[PDB]
Every structure is written in C-alpha cells, then in structure tokens.
Amino acid sequence: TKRSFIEDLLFNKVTLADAGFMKQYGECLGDINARDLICAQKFNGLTVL
Amino acid sequence: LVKQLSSNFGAISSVLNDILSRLDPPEAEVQIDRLITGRLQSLQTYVTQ
Amino acid sequence: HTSSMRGVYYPDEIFRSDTLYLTQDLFLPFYSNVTGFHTGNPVIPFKDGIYFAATEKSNVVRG
Amino acid sequence: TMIFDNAFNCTFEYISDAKHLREFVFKNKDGFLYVYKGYQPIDVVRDLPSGFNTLKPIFKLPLGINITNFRAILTAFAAAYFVGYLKPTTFMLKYDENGTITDAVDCSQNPLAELKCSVKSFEIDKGIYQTSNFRVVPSGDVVRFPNITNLCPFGEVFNATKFPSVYAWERKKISNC
Amino acid sequence: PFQQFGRDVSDFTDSVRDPKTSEILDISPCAFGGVSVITPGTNASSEVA
Amino acid sequence: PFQQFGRDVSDFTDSVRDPKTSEILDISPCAFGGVSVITPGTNASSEVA
C-alpha cells in the first residue's frame, strides 16, 4: 500500500461502513486497477457517488 | 428514507401494482396521488436534512 | 430530402417578449426523412401529421 | 372534376375568395384542422433549401372530421411533394424582438440539444450538467408457473392392452385432473 | 424448501424459486440512473459527450 | 395579426387586443404589497407611521 502505518490504522479501524446496512443503496464498489470494478444497484433508486 | 417508502399515506397498500388490480381507474388515480404526495413529502424532508 | 430545421410554426396565439419558451405540442422534428415525389403523380400517403412544401412556381401544388 | 361527382350529404360550406416555396403543415387534434403557411424565395431546384421559414397560421376549421389521406394533385404539367411525417416531441422556441422566432432547438436529436432545452439557454458553458434519467425498456417476457399438479391419466385411456367392441363400448369418468 | 420467495433489506422482492422446474434464483435489478451531458462550451465547439 | 392576446414570462396574461375596435395594448398590474408600521415605542409616544 502507498499509505503510512498511521493512515492504515485510520483506514482499518473507522471503516466499518455499517455492516448490515451497506446494501441499502446502489454503488459500483471497487477500483479499475484491480480489474474487478463490480457495479451494484438496488430497486430503491438510492445511489452513492 | 428506505423504510418511509413502504408507508400507507392514506392509501390501500404501500406497494405498487397491487392497487391497480383490485380498484377502479378513477379511484386508483387518488390512491396513487396520495402515495405520490407522501413520498414527495418524505423525499423533501430527506433533502432538507 | 432532409427537413433541416424546417416546419417551425406558432403553437398558439400568445404573444411573448424576449424569453425562452418550452413547447410540447410542436411537431416536425429537425433533420427528418421526407418522401419527395419529384416526378407530379397522384399518391395516397399516410396522415396524422405531414409537411407539405412546394418548390414549384405558379402554385402547381394547389389542391 | 372530383367536386361535381356527387352531392349526397353536404355541409359546412365556406368559400374564401378575394422561385416560390409555399410550405403547409396540417394538424388534427380533437377534431381541429390547423393549417399553417409560409413563404421563402429560393432558387435551387434540387430539394428543400436550408433555412428556418417561420410558419403562419391561416385556417383553423375544425370540420369534426378525422382526416386520414390526401391526394388529387394538379395535372397538365417541376412538381414534387416533399412530404414528411412528424412525431410528438418537445421544442424550445426563441422569441426575438417584434415577436419573431427565427430560432428553435429540437430536444430529440442530440444530447447537446436536450441540455440546451433543460437549462433554457442557447449558449452552454463548460462543465457537467445533469439533464434527465435513462431507463432500460424490457424487450422479452418470462412467465413461469407450476407445471402439473394432478396429471391426467390420458395414457391409460389411449395406450391400453385392448378395447371393447362397438356394440359393447365402455365410457370413462375422467375428471378432476 | 418452505421458503418460496425472498425479499431484500429494502423490503423488495430479491429472488424466488422457479415454480416449473430447476429451482434457481431470480431477478436482479437493471441498470438505471441519471444521464449527464458533458459539453466543452458552445462558443468553443459543438461537441457533446 | 393572428395573435389575439399575449402572456408574460411568468405565464400570466399581459396584453390582449381590443375585441370591439382600436386594437391596442392592455392590462398592467396594480399596486399592492405589504404595509409596514413604524413606531418609535409605545412608552415614548403614541405616534405611528
């Protein structure tokens, strides 16, 4: 990773994203570098940019 | 905002494609207008917040 | 053979000052496909909206 | 000669008595025939020349008739038709001085035109502007249901070891299947 | 086996077995959203993305 | 000549030709607004503007 140890601790402790409620909105999670770039949508019409 | 979508804003049911197979078109007009007004008020409150 | 920005009529009788009005009842979209019978021959085309333009002098197409 | 053919049922008699490019557009809506007229001096003989040619309404005789055809052009003859059909779409009309249009934008051909119609402007600045929402129209259709619950024993009736004679024929009571 | 259909967290029908044969999952949401227009300026050029 | 009446940018009837004779322009809006009261204080005096 291109981050420091403190940045890794900050991005690995507060990044809970409300496990269980993350599927309440459509979003294309992932990065283009990993060549996965999974696009996910929901019927509610709510999207997070 | 998601849970407010399934709310009976003075209509028969809070689910589409259900009030159109058991009611008349002239009554379905108001049955849909009530839900539309309720959802618009909920979305306006969400946008204000 | 193409209606390049042709067929723009007044949709109503309302006089409007300098502004940008949005019309919904206006028809004849730009760059359409017209069928010109440049020969004249009596034919029976369809209806529900047409664009009858005559490029001939002395009012040949008058009926 | 088509006028003097027959006069069985006649009504609504209205006679209004008193190169070249005369354009006409006919519209039938709720039993109302809208007639527009426009003139433009042209010189080319190939096809419809470029331009705008704002049309002017002349007649609005309803006639309560749902017209569906048009024919009987002149004879004894250049004579073309240049007829083009139309579809219901939205338009943005500019209104310059003295109440003339001289400019219009059809919001159905390019995304740039739709953007110009959305923000109500002919000169668009640089940047991203949300205009509308796209939808995917379903093409096919899938219908699935339970195949069979109580299969009818038609194989026992058709495929059997032997059948009785004609004078001693036996019927069946196949029901609730 | 007793479960016929299934809903999501947003109170929307997620999947359902095939009633005829080969009981598998079912509908996923289709692609939608708001189309945006990219214009480098009308005075500059007439391109559009 | 074909236009009978005309509206403003606010979709309100601005002008209209005279049906009887002497076709000229027509109605302009009247005077209205919110009347305010100027008081230098009840304990000071009883004047009011």
DSSP C4-36: TT---B-SSS-B--SEEEEESS----SS-B-B-
Contact indicator for D37, D54 with CB cutoff of 8 Å: no
Look up tokens 């302009």; give the residue: F28
Going by beta carbons, is chain B in contact with chain E, meaning 3 or more pairs sit under 8 Å apart?
A: yes
Partner residue opposite F15 with nearest CB, options C10, C15, C19: C15
Q: 3-state SS of chain A: helix, strand, coil percent to 5?
A: 20, 10, 70
Partner residue opposite E29 with nearest CB, options A20, A24, A41: A41
Q: How far apart are CA D39 and CA D24, in angstroms?
A: 10
Q: What is the DSSP letter of E31?
A: P
- Those residues whose C-beta lies under 8 Å from the C-beta of residue B11, and which sit 6 or more positions away, are B19, B31, B32, B34, B35
- Cβ <8 Å between D122 and E42: yes
Closest listed residue to residue D22, CA positions, set D42, D47, D50, D44: D42
Look up tokens 């077995």; give the residue: E17
Contact indicator for D92, D73 with CB cutoff of 8 Å: no
- Cβ <8 Å between A43 and E29: yes
Partner residue opposite D115 with nearest CB, options E21, E34, E39: E39
- Mutation site, F2, F4, F7, F16, interface C, largest C CB count within 10 A: F7
What phi and psi values does residue B18 have, to the nearest 5 degrees? -115, -35
Indicate the residue type of A37.
L
In chain D, the residue whose alpha carbon lies closest to the alpha carbon of F7 is D99
Structure-token pair, residue D74:
């002149």
In chain F, the residue whose alpha carbon lies closest to the alpha carbon of D58 is F2
Q: How far apart are CA D86 and CA C32, in angstroms?
A: 8
